[PDB]
C-alpha cells in the first residue's frame, strides 16, 4: 500500500523546500497531497513562485490520515503555519497517532508554536535557531538533517534533497531512498 | 541596472529545474519573468506541481530583450520547448545578440533542435546524453555545469543550484553569487 504524504503550503513558504519534497516523494511513489493552509486558491511562495494546491487544507484533512505531515519553510510561510489552529489540530493529531512529522528551514518553528515534540533533538535553519530554541525545549543540531524518531527537520534550501531523501528512506526504506536518489544527480 | 531573466515553462518541465532557478536568480536580484509556452494559464509539471506563470510566452517575448534564456529540463517539457517555433525564435534572437542561454537536465536537447549553439562543450542529464549529441555537433561534458562562452548548461535536479549559481555569477558577478549561496545552507 502506498504511503501518504500531506504538504502544507501556505502563503511565504520557500517556494524551493515545498517543490523539492513534493517531487522527490512523488518520484518514491508515496501519494503526496499539496494542501493550500488558505483555500483551494494558488499560494504567493516567498520568491513569487505561485503554486496551485491540490487540495484546501480542510479538504485533504478529511482524507487522512497521512504517513507524513510536512511543513515547508519561508518565515513568512512558517509564521502563518505557526498561526493557524487547523494546523495545531493536525499535527497534534499526528503525533498522537505516532506518525512522522517532518519540517525545514524556518518550518519546525511552527513545531514550537504548537508544542510539538518537546524534548526532541532538531535543526533549523541557522537564523532560526534562536526562535527554535526559546524556553529550551528542543535540543539543537547543526546535522544537515536530524532525525530523533517521529520529528525529522532540516536546514535549509541547500539540504532540501537530504531532507526528502530522509523522508522516503523513513517511509520506503533505504532502497527506495538510492533507487530515487540516483537519477537526481546528487553530489 | 537590474538583470533580467526569461524562464520559459512547459507542461511536464522538471519543477525542481524550474523553481531553483527561479528563486536563486531572484535571491540575486534579477528581474525573473515565468513565461508559460501555451499561454497564461497554469503549467503542470512533470511530478504534478502546478505553476502559474507570471506571463504568456508571447507577451514575456514583447519585454525583451533577456539577459539570460532559461530552458527547464524534464522529458516531456524539454520536448514542447523543441517542437516550439516560438522557442526556436527566441533562441535565434538570443544567439544572435550574443545573449546568454541557459539549459539543464533534458533541457540542452531544445538548443539542438533548434541548432543553437553547435561546437559548444555542453552537459545534459546523463539519459539525455545520446539525443543531444546526435550528429556530434556539440562536445560532451560530465561537469555538473558546463559553460562554454555564453552556452551555460548542467545535468538534473541535484545539479539545479549550481546551474542557478552559475548563472547569478554569469549575470552579477562572483561576490554576489557567493552571498547569495551562503544562506541556502548548500554542502
Same mark, same amino acid.
Request: neutral net charge; glycine residues 10%; charged residues 25%.
Given at each position: 500500500?502506498?504511503?501518504?504524504?500531506?504538504?502544507?503550503?501556505?502563503?511565504?513558504?520557500?517556494?524551493?523546500?515545498?517543490?523539492?519534497?513534493?517531487?522527490?516523494?512523488?518520484?518514491?511513489?508515496?501519494?503526496?497531497?499539496?494542501?493550500? !493552509?488558505?483555500?483551494?486558491?494558488?499560494? *504567493?511562495?516567498?520568491?513569487?513562485?505561485?503554486?496551485?494546491?491540490?487540495?484546501?487544507?480542510?479538504?485533504?484533512?478529511?482524507?487522512?490520515?497521512?504517513?507524513?505531515?510536512?511543513?515547508?519553510?519561508?518565515?513568512?510561510?512558517? *509564521?502563518?503555519?505557526?498561526?493557524?489552529?487547523?494546523? %495545531?489540530?493536525?499535527?497534534?493529531? *499526528?503525533?498522537?497517532?505516532?506518525? !512522522?512529522?517532518?519540517?525545514?528551514?524556518?518550518?519546525?518553528?511552527?513545531?514550537?508554536?504548537?508544542?510539538?515534540?518537546?524534548?526532541? %533533538?532538531?535543526?533549523?535553519?541557522?537564523?532560526?535557531?534562536?526562535?527554535?530554541?526559546?524556553?529550551?525545549?528542543?535540543?539543537?543540531?547543526?546535522?544537515?538533517?536530524?532525525?530523533?524518531?517521529?520529528?525529522?527537520?532540516?536546514?535549509?534550501?541547500?539540504?532540501?534533497?537530504?531532507?526528502?531523501?530522509?523522508?522516503?528512506?523513513?517511509?520506503?526504506? @533505504?532502497?527506495?531512498?538510492? *533507487?530515487? @536518489?540516483?537519477? !537526481?544527480?546528487?553530489?
Amino acid at each position: 500500500a502506498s504511503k501518504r504524504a500531506l504538504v502544507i503550503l501556505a502563503k511565504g513558504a520557500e517556494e524551493m523546500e515545498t517543490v523539492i519534497p513534493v517531487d522527490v516523494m512523488r518520484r518514491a511513489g508515496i501519494k503526496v497531497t499539496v494542501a493550500g !493552509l488558505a483555500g483551494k486558491d494558488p499560494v *504567493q511562495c516567498s520568491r513569487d513562485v505561485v503554486i496551485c494546491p491540490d487540495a484546501s487544507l480542510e479538504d485533504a484533512k478529511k482524507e487522512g490520515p497521512y504517513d507524513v505531515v510536512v511543513l515547508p519553510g519561508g518565515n513568512l510561510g512558517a *509564521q502563518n503555519l505557526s498561526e493557524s489552529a487547523a494546523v %495545531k489540530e493536525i499535527l497534534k493529531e *499526528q503525533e498522537n497517532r505516532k506518525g !512522522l512529522i517532518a519540517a525545514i528551514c524556518a518550518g519546525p518553528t511552527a513545531l514550537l508554536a504548537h508544542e510539538i515534540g518537546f524534548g526532541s %533533538k532538531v535543526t533549523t535553519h541557522p537564523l532560526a535557531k534562536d526562535k527554535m530554541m526559546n524556553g529550551g525545549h528542543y535540543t539543537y543540531s547543526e546535522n544537515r538533517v536530524e532525525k530523533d524518531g517521529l520529528i525529522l527537520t532540516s536546514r535549509g534550501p541547500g539540504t532540501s534533497f537530504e531532507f526528502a531523501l530522509a523522508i522516503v528512506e523513513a517511509l520506503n526504506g @533505504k532502497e527506495v531512498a538510492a *533507487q530515487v @536518489k540516483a537519477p !537526481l544527480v546528487l553530489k
